[PDB]
């Protein structure tokens, strides 16, 4: 029937083995009786707080589930993060979905702050928190369409996964155009914009036949006159010519006179 919550009496006991059967059982019945275990808290909390318990990493899960049921999400991730493996990795249940959502929701807040103060003052990021997000990042990569994880990729900075996503199978370099457009239009930090652009150019260069049209267009916003100058020279020395002309004819129709005056100057050398 399971119409009682005296198990919390077990967790009141002292036999370390007996706690484990109680702690396990609650996590098998926490989804229903979240009430009583909410008052327990400290009882389950102290079990994880204590470093000697045999199954502490199970204590947090049950305790985390109780808090998730109760609704104090600010503390649900804390205990969820402390646990591991069984903690949330299962990536199957609704409680996982709500904890992961915040956890990847919590992650971006830290990373956005971090990119503001990267001069060593940057606040630390927990490996488990990064572990879960990148695991998700590793999850979003290998699950299905990557034109989504890219958005979550640049959502929480993490340029490495950004490069990985587009450089990965990526079906076609068409998703590169999708990302590029998003970088220009729906990016509100120039310092990030520059960093996104560097990734977009670097992917452009490593391509077998790099998209000169986009790369020069990408560079203009990045404000790289010399870099475009060297690109122009190699294209000439490779006997491309035909594609080189539009890159110049598209260049004059966007850039500034200072940009051109500098870019022209490089060629003369």
């Amino acid at each position: 029937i399971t119409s009682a919550a005296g198990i919390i009496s077990l967790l009141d006991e002292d036999e370390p083995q007996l706690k484990e059967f109680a702690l396990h059982k609650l996590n098998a019945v926490v989804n229903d009786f979240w009430a009583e275990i909410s008052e327990s808290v400290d009882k389950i909390e102290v079990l994880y707080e204590d470093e000697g318990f045999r199954s502490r990493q199970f204590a947090a899960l049950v305790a985390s589930k109780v808090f998730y049921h109760l609704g104090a999400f600010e503390e649900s991730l804390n205990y969820a993060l402390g646990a591991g493996d069984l903690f949330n990795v299962n990536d199957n249940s609704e409680y996982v979905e709500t904890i992961i959502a915040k956890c990847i929701d919590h992650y971006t807040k830290q990373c956005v702050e971090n990119a503001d103060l990267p001069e060593g003052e940057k606040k630390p990021i927990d490996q488990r928190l990064e572990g879960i997000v990148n695991k998700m990042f590793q999850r979003c990569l290998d699950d299905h369409k990557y034109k989504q994880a890219i958005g979550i990729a640049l959502e929480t900075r993490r340029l490495d996964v950004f490069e990985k996503t587009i450089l990965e199978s990526n079906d076609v370099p068409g998703m590169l155009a999708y990302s590029l457009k998003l970088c220009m239009s729906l990016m509100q930090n120039k310092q990030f914009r520059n960093k996104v652009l560097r990734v977009l150019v670097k992917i452009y260069m490593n391509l077998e036949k790099p998209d000169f049209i986009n790369v020069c267009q990408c560079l203009i916003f990045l404000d790289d006159p010399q870099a475009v100058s060297d690109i122009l020279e190699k294209l000439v020395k490779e006997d491309n010519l035909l594609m080189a002309y539009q890159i110049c004819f598209d260049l004059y129709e966007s850039a500034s006179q200072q940009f051109l005056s500098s870019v022209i100057q490089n060629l003369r050398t």
Binding site: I1, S3, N31, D32, A35, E39, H69, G71, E94
Partner: protein, 443 residues
Amino acid sequence: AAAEHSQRELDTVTLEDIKEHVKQLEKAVSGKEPRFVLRALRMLPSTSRRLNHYVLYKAVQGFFTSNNATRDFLLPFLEEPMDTEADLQFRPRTGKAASTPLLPEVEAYLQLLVVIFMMNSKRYKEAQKISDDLMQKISTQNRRALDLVAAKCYYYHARVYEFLDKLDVVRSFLHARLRTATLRHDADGQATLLNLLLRNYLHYSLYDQAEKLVSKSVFPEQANNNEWARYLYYTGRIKAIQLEYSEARRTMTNALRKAPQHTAVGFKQTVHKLLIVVELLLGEIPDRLQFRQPSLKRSLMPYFLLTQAVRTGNLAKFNQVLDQFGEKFQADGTYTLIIRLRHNVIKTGVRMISLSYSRISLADIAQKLQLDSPEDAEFIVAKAIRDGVIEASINHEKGYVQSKEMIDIYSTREPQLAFHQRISFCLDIHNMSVKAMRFPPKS
């Protein structure tokens, strides 16, 4: 038969009502306002009845009919009409509309109507399979509007299980399904689920388990009047058992005030049943206008003989009533509370003495309350004084229970505080009225 011909006219009108609901249901989905659905869902109880097998079939043959497995699920679960002469093809979805999968709102609404019909047809399992699939459909469905239509189905689904008379199989389901809403900031669904859940809890007398759930959970303040009325009764039932009497009256009287004027003869019947017993245990003689009212006249007459007993204080009369009408109380779920009273009849008379007398000598209190000895009253006189049923001080130096010298309140700060709670609500009403004001996006 002309009765069914009006019925199909009722069907078509219900279909038109449904089409009105579906068109409004499809209106809200693209209308960007979940409010529209509430109108269709309030007509739901009205349209809940007035439907037989031809209704849904033509509706499901009128709606859906996308060749989707949906037809294959509820069509077999409801009797299909013959080749009726008036084959009014009521297809609000024409071709592409049929091709387009039914929005999660209308499908559940149509399925709920089948579910309702399932209830109306006592087919709680076909509805069970219908409904859980409905849930199995709407469990994944994460729209914002479906939460409303889901909420109505939930209670019906709780109601289909309600007629299934298990209530534990859905104890967990409704217990978890609740948590899905709260993690969505959804308003109505959380409200409806909680009330059904609590009803589950009291139905087996797990008041301890129930008392917790209300302790941590927070009922959405901006909730349906219908629901707000329900939650207040269940909390009142819990509070009364938990010996928090004074709060039991405040919520139950407030729960009663929220009853849907004159639709629910029953709910008003049960609440008054607890209110009368709840009030007695607190030392207040309940209102007489209750026991004369038409709907509650015979229903509360069993409690009537009780309240007369308490005021009379004739314990022999009080026991006599429990012996006869007592057994009926159990079904009402009140016998236990009455048992508390039997050894608490002395309190009111202690209040009656404190309300009229102001310096009654203890020996006199014993005479007027039937207490055996002047010494016995002292514990009872103090206890009533101790428990805040009186406002008196027992000066044991000479055995007189002095009552508190009442003051001119208007010169103290009580009236200002009473005006503050009043003005805050009055101003809030203005903000709530002004805040919505629902100026339609100027067409």
